[PDB]
Amino acid sequence: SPITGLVYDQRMMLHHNMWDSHHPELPQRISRIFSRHEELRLLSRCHRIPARLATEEELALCHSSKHISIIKSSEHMKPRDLNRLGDEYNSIFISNESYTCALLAAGSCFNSAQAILTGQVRNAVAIVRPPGHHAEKDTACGFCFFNTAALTARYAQSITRESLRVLIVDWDVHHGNGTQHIFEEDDSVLYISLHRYEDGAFFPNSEDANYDKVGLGKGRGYNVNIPWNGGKMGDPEYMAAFHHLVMPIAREFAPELVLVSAGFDAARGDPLGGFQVTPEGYAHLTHQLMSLAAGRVLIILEGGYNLTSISESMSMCTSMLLGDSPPSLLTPLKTSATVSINNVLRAHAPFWSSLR
Numbered sequence: 126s127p128i129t130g131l132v133y134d135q136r137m138m139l140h141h142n143m144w145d146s147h148h149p150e151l152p153q154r155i156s157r158i159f160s161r162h163e164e165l166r167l168l169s170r171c172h173r174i175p176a177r178l179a180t181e182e183e184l185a186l187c188h189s190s191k192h193i194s195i196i197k198s199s200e201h202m203k204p205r206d207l208n209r210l211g212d213e214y215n216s217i218f219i220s221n222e223s224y225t226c227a228l229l230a231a232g233s234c235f236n237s238a239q240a241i242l243t244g245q246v247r248n249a250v251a252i253v254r255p256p257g258h259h260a261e262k263d264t265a266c267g268f269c270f271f272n273t274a275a276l277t278a279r280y281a282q283s284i285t286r287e288s289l290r291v292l293i294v295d296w297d298v299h300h301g302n303g304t305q306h307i308f309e310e311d312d313s314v315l316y317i318s319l320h321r322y323e324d325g326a327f328f329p330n331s332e333d334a335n336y337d338k339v340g341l342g343k344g345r346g347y348n349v350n351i352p353w354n355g356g357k358m359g360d361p362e363y364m365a366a367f368h369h370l371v372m373p374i375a376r377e378f379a380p381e382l383v384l385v386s387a388g389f390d391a392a393r394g395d396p397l398g399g400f401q402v403t404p405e406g407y408a409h410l411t412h413q414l415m416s417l418a419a420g421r422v423l424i425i426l427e428g429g430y431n432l433t434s435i436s437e438s439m440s441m442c443t444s445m446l447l448g449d450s451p452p453s454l455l456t457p458l459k460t461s462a463t464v465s466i467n468n469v470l471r472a473h474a475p476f477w478s479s480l481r
């Protein structure tokens with residue numbers, strides 16, 4: 126009821142890079158975040174939600190039978206065939222434990238969404254790996270095998286109603302290409318992504334991440350890309366994007382469930398992101414999202430590679446979900462961030478009355 130759920134399972138650490146033990150998507154990303162929850166005495170304040178495996182029928186909510194079979198077959202592959210398989214995708218490493226870990230990341234979030242929708246908890250945090258937002262219906266991409274957040278939105282609809290309004294806010298520094306594509310023609314799942322773009326120089330290097338990709342057919346206006354260019358964005362820019370775009374659109378949509386594709390790679394210290402969002406910044410973003418869907422928010426870990434930065438930033442999010450007071454939070458925005466916000470406003474004003 127006025128309770129916060131938490132899911133963490135050390136078995137998700139088994140997925141590893143056998144060729145490059147220093148690859149940034151480390152097993153210790155989740156163990157360090159979990160340890161930070163214990164240090165801050167946040168863990169004991171949460172209701173512990175068990176991890177479970179997603180079933181193949183559950184993966185079929187978003188992914189093709191071919192994709193599921195190929196990833197599933199990797200459990201039995203010798204190192205040379207895992208190397209060959211991983212090479213078929215853009216930025217993927219596979220071990221014999223990868224498939225099981227991807228299943229545990231998905232099942233953990235389904236048990237979390239279930240705990241929220243059955244009223245066992247009000248909100249929840251899922252300390253999971255490998256991430257999921259780059260995974261497409263038919264392919265793995267950018268360290269992602271199955272689209273955990275997209276699958277969770279479909280799972281939530283499968284236990285309530287097909288038309289359950291789900292908002293996905295993706296604040297990982299990378300565009301969730303897989304999430305956008307899965308729901309592109311869908312008006313029941315509003316996808317809002319903030320991401321470093323650099324006119325396509327930043328991963329995943331596609332114009333699909335630009336502000337003018339507003340969705341297709343009945344999904345027109347239900348895909349909101351907030352792309353950053355020419356600038357090391359931080360709290361002022363993220364707070365402004367939430368003030369002018371994320372919160373007015375989300376309030377008009379009136380979601381019944383909020384999923385956060387919460388990568389912490391836009392954080393200060395992240396070696397891949399190059400951005401400066403502070404743990405207090407993430408706490409303010411989380412607190413804002415809690416005003417939606419009667420507080421039904423599920424925070425799902427995506428990217429984020431500086432171990433101290435992700436541990437502090439995610440723990441700060443859990444603290445906000447537990448009802449703790451938002452911490453003290455800057456400056457005028459980078460000129461290109463105003464350009465980006467204004468481009469999104471022009472793109473989405475025809476679909477949202479709150480922007481007009």
Ligand SMILES: NNC(=O)c1ccc(Cn2nnc(-c3ccccn3)n2)nc1
Pocket residue numbers: 148149216256259267268297299328388390397427428429
């Ligand atoms: N949420 N998505 C992501 O977090 C995401 C996905 C894909 C990439 C591409 N990439 N960048 N650096 C690398 C890299 C660095 C060191 C060793 C091997 N690889 N790989 N970046 C980030």
Ligand SMILES: [K+]
Pocket residue numbers: 295296297298299300301318319320
């Ligand atoms: K994003």
Ligand SMILES: [K+]
Pocket residue numbers: 308309310311312314315316340344347348
């Ligand atoms: K959509």
Ligand SMILES: [Zn+2]
Pocket residue numbers: 297298299388390427428429
């Ligand atoms: Zn990322």
